[PDB]
Amino acid sequence: SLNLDSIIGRLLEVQGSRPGKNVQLTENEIRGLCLKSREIFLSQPILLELEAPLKICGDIHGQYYDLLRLFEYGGFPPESNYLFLGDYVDRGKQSLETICLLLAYKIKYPENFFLLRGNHECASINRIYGFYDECKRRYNIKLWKTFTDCFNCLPIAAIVDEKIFCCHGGLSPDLQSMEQIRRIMRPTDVPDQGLLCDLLWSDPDKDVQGWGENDRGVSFTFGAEVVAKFLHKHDLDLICRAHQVVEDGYEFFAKRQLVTLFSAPNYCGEFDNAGAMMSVDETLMCSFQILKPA
Amino acid sequence: SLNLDSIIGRLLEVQGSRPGKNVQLTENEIRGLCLKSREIFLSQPILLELEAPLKICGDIHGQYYDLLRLFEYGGFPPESNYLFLGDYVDRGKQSLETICLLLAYKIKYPENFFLLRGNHECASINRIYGFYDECKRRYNIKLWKTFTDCFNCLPIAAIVDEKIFCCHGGLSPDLQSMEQIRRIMRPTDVPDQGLLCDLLWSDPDKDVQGWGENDRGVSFTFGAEVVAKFLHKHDLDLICRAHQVVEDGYEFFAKRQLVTLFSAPNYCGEFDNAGAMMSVDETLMCSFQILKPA
Amino acid sequence: SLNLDSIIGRLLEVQGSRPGKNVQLTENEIRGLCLKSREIFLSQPILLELEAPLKICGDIHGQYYDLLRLFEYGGFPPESNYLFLGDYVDRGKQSLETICLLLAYKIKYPENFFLLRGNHECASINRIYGFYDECKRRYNIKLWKTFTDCFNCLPIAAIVDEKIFCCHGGLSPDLQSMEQIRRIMRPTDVPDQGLLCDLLWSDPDKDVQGWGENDRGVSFTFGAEVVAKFLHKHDLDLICRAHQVVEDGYEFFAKRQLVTLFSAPNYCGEFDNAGAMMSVDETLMCSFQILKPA
Amino acid sequence: LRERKILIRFSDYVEVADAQDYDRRADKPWTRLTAADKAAIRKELNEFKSTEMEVHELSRHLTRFHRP
Amino acid sequence: RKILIRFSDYVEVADAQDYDRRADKPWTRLTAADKAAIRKELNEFKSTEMEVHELSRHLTRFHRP
Amino acid sequence: LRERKILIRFSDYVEVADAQDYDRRADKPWTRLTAADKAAIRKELNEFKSTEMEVHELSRHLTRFHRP
Amino acid sequence: ELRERKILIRFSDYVEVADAQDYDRRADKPWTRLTAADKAAIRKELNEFKSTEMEVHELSRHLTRFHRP
Ligand SMILES: [Mn+2]
Ligand SMILES: [Mn+2]
Ligand SMILES: [Mn+2]
Ligand SMILES: [Mn+2]
Ligand SMILES: [Mn+2]
Ligand SMILES: [Mn+2]
């Protein structure tokens, strides 16, 4: 059986060390994290219904030590409840530490800690952008296939107190009813087009009236009119998404009807961006706290 | 009806005999101790609110003749007020004599004699580490089930003069409010993880910034920073715990913001440690009295 | 019979870890460090005659990770030559790691690495101010007596290129000829008064014309004209000492004829001081590099 | 599209703290791939997703196969 | 924050009884079969015979088969 | 005193770097020594220095003994 | 600063790969059967060899790797 507190403990023990120090979990420990977390993801709806108080965070991309600082900043679980918006692995040098801690907290606090699926939580993408290479290097290929079964069961979106719609990428032209999301069955892959694809890939663009081309070569861009229509239709107040690096870690769109969240500061050591998280309180008052590079 | 003075007398009579000699209580007498003491535990809060003068002691682990000496040293009840921090049974050879004297003193001086629950005062642990075997050899399996119902009702923590927080193991990441301890209902088992587990199992560790792995494979370790923010949060001055063998019977941590107490000298005949008690007087002045192996 | 490179490697590889983490050397390895270094100390003069290039450092007081940071900054031996001015142990938490690395480097680079005796390298002082407690806790009392034997053999002062007189404390009224230092035989204790005491205990004072009272209750204070008279008589240009915390890590006295060096930044967590070292190149051009808290 | 009462509110106070300072520059292995590499990887995914990757019956139409 | 507690610098010392405290450690000789049987015993005991308040049943520490 | 030639020079450039950032505060138990403690330590130091600590024959007059 | 210095070296994305010979490379390890007396006798032989026979430049005699008796 799973030694959950030992795994979490070992993962936290690098606090105060210089970034880059690895955590050495065993193969069976990691497999255990995947199996039990997967089970939980499937026990909970694919469209999560969450309640404030809650802190919402965006991309991490294996910047494990920035995730630790983020917890230090906003409170380690269960001091705060957390909802992550995806893109835990790839690009960074420590995707395994990042996702293992996130999965372990899902198992420790399943009613107070939630993870959404990013476009990098699928086989085809994280086969190329680092996670596969990190699994094969430090353990083996089978472990990456085990992670894939877990990723294929991640929930795709969440509504906080019937007013904040959360997903990794954004809106879809194919999204006319929330039941369309609820009806998606897991485990599943991320398709190259369609509703699930857009939820993980689409981007807002000020220069687009409705829908437009996406420089990524996947999915679409969408404009402010799309957002306003969506919020009115479902009597929502805000779209909260991630997926794009923004200077202050958060960045509003369409008259504060949408916010982009990004939690990996100094992303890839190529940008000068802060990382942010949004706190929602019981009265639906939203505030931002950011970790800025010095 | 119960013959308490007779039990205490028989239990204290072996004082001066060769260590290892068995006090022979009857089956019915032992069940009387367990039932009456259980009643008292349940009539007092699970989070004790105590007042100095008081002497605080740590692990005994069935070293019955070391317990008799401890009472010689500090005064047989009610000469002094006592607070024990758990781990009365297991490992030692005379866990029955130890727990019977302690229960009997709880019935004798219920307002001046207090017992906290240790991690060995739970079924799964003392099933393996001796106490069960001791009960079966000298009596029957049912007597061990009777002790279990008594241990499941012990209080878990204690605050002395609103300034010294006492428990067996230490702090918990899930402990944000004293009310979380007060809402723990008895009788209860000790779980494999969570608040009640950590209160009986965690260990301080100077190497850990916040939380870390516990060599025991249960619960966590915690650092000076955790202790500091805890005392400041609840306006406490000290944490008093046991659980670990320390050379002098007492040992400070985080600039004397926490103290470990251990009262079983020459533990298991494997360490050359002293056993200690901590006296707290009306001034909240603390002093240490130790029994060292010669 | 000593694997010095394995010892040094273990001491240096905690670099990057959280400050406070220990290095586990065996008792016999530490004994080997002491006995071998002691032989080297005795084979070299009690008044060292050194040559630039050289980097001179002040107190460390067991702040092991600040010593590692110092070496990172100034260059790990033998990239730079080093002279330390004493007080390696006591007060800080990791005196054993500190002195073991310094002694290992003295054995490894005996012509490029030098340690002078501070007032805390004597049994009466470091019995009280922490080192003795550290040895008893991690090893045994006998090991402390082995360090005492090694400490009793340290050189007391050093002259760099016949122009910079170096000692931990300062001048003595009983210092008329350098021969008085030379004729001191080792192993020796530190007396309660007189030349060997003053050299490790005295302090400069601006408000003193000649000699004054020392608030330590030991030795004396001395004035700037005493410094100027001393330098003229022996044709020296600078007195380089430590013994006192100064805000910038280095602080001049007597019109830059005496400098205090202190290498423990944020000393005892009580001051907001920088730690400094002084570099003397081949031309006797001196320069300062400081590690400042942020 | 304006009478619709809004419930959410945003605080005008934004907390700012320092982020850790270390070298986040990372190696980009996907930039050393060749045309043949991608073909082998596409063959690998098709074989993995067809015969190994568990997929709910009602979601097999979402499995993202690749071109040879 | 103001601190009320104080510590006394006088440590009372006395002698502990001198006897052989070494004891057998039966748990070190448990086989896999033994552990499994004991996990079975505890699960049955805790399920049917151990009194647990209704609100603390989520804390009962059951064991794997 | 005024015209003695001086060889030493000081550079005007002071290099500055960041010291490590960690909690350096540490317990100071020696401030908690009783007169009985200090008497017991004084006796220990006297026995150790007089019967065990090696000292060159010409430096035994420097040995720092403590009052009873 | 380290990242702005010009680098000349380059690496090719194509790696040639051939099949190595397929034979049994298992070999004996005589050193694993040296007794304490054997090693002590070998240390004495090396010491005699290096002190009296092995040619060493005059300026490098301090590097000669002698062994514990
Ligand atoms: Mn991303
Ligand atoms: Mn993305
Ligand atoms: Mn115990
Ligand atoms: Mn315990
Ligand atoms: Mn000092
Ligand atoms: Mn000093």
Residue numbers in the entry:
A (entry chain K), B (entry chain I), C (entry chain P): 6 to 57, 60, 60A, 60B, 61 to 299
D (entry chain X), F (entry chain W): 513 to 580
E (entry chain U): 516 to 580
G (entry chain V): 512 to 580
What wording appears in the published article?
The three Protein Phosphatase 1 (PP1) isoforms regulate diverse cellular processes, acting in partnership with over 200 different PP1-interacting proteins (PIPs). The four Phosphatase and actin regulator (Phactr) proteins are novel PIPs that are implicated in cytoskeletal regulation in animal models and cell culture settings. Here, we show that Phactr1 confers sequence-specificity on the Phactr1/PP1 holoenzyme. We show that efficient catalysis requires interactions between conserved hydrophobic residues in the substrate and a novel Phactr1-PP1 composite surface, which comprises a hydrophobic pocket and associated amphipathic cavity with a surrounding basic rim.
We determined the structures of purified Phactr1(507-580)/PP1α(7-300) (1.9 Å) and Phactr1(516-580)/PP1α(7-300) (1.94 Å), which crystallised at pH 8.5 and pH 5.25, respectively, and exhibit differing conformations of Phactr1 residues C-terminal to residue 567. In both structures, the PP1 catalytic site contains two presumed manganese ions and a phosphate anion, as previously reported, and its conformation is virtually identical to that seen in other PP1 complexes, such as spinophilin/PP1 (RMSD 0.23 Å over 255 Cα atoms). The Phactr1 C-terminal sequences are well resolved in the pH 8.5 structure, which is also adopted by Phactr1(516-580)/PP1α(7-300) when substrates occupy the PP1 active site, and which is supported by BLI data (discussed below). Phactr1 residues 516–542 wrap around PP1, occluding its C-terminal groove, and covering 2260 Å2 of solvent-accessible surface, contacting PP1 in a strikingly similar way to spinophilin, PNUTS and PPP1R15B. These contacts include a non-canonical RVxF motif, a ϕϕ motif, an Arg motif, and a previously unrecognised Trp motif. Residues 545–565 include a five-turn amphipathic α-helix that abuts the PP1 hydrophobic groove: Phactr1 residues L545, I553, L557, F560 make hydrophobic contacts with PP1 I133, R132, W149, and K150, while E556 and E564 make salt bridges with PP1 R132 and K150, respectively, and K561 hydrogen bonds with PP1 S129 and D194. The positioning of the Phactr1 amphipathic helix creates a deep hydrophobic pocket comprising Phactr1 W542, L545, K550, I553, R554, L557 and H578, and PP1 I130 I133 and Y134. Adjacent to the pocket, a narrow amphipathic cavity is formed by the positioning of Phactr1 K561 and R576 across the PP1 hydrophobic groove: its polar side comprises Phactr1 K561 and R576, and PP1 D194 and S129, while its hydrophobic side is formed from PP1 residues C127, I130, V195, W206 and V223. The new composite surface is crowned by a basic rim, formed from Phactr1 residues K550, R554, R576, H578 and R579, which radically alters the surface charge distribution. The Phactr1/PP1 complex also contains a bound water, W1, presumably activated by the metal ions and PP1 D64 and D92.
